[PDB]
Design a protein around this ligand. Structure first.
Ligand SMILES: *[C@@H]1O[C@H](CO[C@@H]2O[C@@H](C)[C@@H](O)[C@@H](O)[C@@H]2O)[C@@H](O[C@@H]2O[C@H](CO)[C@@H](O)[C@H](O)[C@H]2NC(C)=O)[C@H](O)[C@H]1NC(C)=O
Ligand SMILES: *[C@@H]1O[C@H](CO)[C@@H](O[C@@H]2O[C@H](CO)[C@@H](O)[C@H](O)[C@H]2NC(C)=O)[C@H](O)[C@H]1NC(C)=O
Ligand SMILES: *[C@@H]1O[C@H](CO)[C@@H](O)[C@H](O)[C@H]1NC(C)=O
Lengths: 100, 85
């Protein structure tokens, strides 16, 4: 008499929502979260976020290639760490194991 | 009766418009960056405008600041920077 009900939203729909959020934050910055999505070049958006943390735009515009390279290296390192860490997704696995 | 109702008054931007933008303005071998806004262009002339509301203004030395030359900035364009002096 014990059964598991499938979630209302499939993994495909959650992935689609995540991809929509990614596209919005890449092509419009924070504008789409507060209203209509306003297109903007990505380096300009990152200069914007540099302004938000108290750094002038020129610091970014004179080091755009270095910043992009650092971001790509960090993304690659994150992928490698998630692939190689024996227990990285421990929270979700613990939830599943607790239910089981 | 058993909770609270918050009436949130917020600002929603509307009626956007296409504009051509540049990271910086090249003038006299100097790179000018906007102090508070963004460089935009309706197609022929360049202005500096504030952020969440379109208010084009003449690009001067008061609303822009200088940092380096035009060699390193990618996407820099030539335009005149007005000097009120
Ligand atoms: C933007 O301008 C640069 C620099 O040119 C200077 O500014 C101009 C407005 C004008 O006053 C020039 O005499 C100044 O030298 C341009 O770079 C020049 O490019 C041409 C060929 O395109 C080349 O022969 C020159 O040597 C370059 N100038 C220098 C100083 O190296 C640039 O092409 C302009 N950009 C656009 C899109 O027109
Ligand atoms: C971009 O905006 C500028 C605002 O300065 C326009 O240029 C002005 O146009 C008016 C309308 O005829 C003229 O009276 C002014 O003399 C113009 N100023 C200058 C400095 O030429 C410009 O026409 C606009 N461009 C587009 C494509 O809309
Ligand atoms: C802005 O530019 C895009 C480019 O295709 C266009 O589809 C859109 O309608 C433009 N927006 C306005 C408000 O003119």
């Amino acid at each position: 008499g014990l059964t598991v009900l499938p979630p209302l939203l499939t993994d495909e729909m959650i992935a689609q929502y995540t991809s929509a959020l990614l596209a919005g934050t890449i092509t419009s910055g924070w504008t789409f979260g507060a209203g209509p999505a306003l297109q903007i070049p990505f380096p300009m958006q990152m200069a914007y976020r540099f302004n938000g943390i108290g750094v002038t735009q020129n610091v970014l515009y004179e080091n755009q290639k270095l910043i992009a390279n650092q971001f790509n290296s960090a993304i690659g390192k994150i992928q490698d760490s998630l692939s190689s860490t024996p227990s990285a997704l421990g929270k979700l696995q613990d939830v599943v194991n607790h239910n089981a | 009766p058993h909770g609270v109702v918050f009436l949130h008054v917020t600002y929603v931007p509307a009626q956007e418009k296409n504009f051509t933008t540049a990271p910086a303005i090249c003038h006299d071998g100097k790179a000018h960056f906007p102090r508070e806004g963004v460089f935009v262009s309706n197609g022929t002339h360049w202005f500096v405008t504030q952020r969440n509301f379109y208010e084009p203004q003449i690009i001067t030395t008061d609303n822009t600041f200088v940092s380096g030359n035009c060699d390193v900035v990618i996407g820099i364009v030539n335009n005149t920077v007005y000097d009120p002096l």
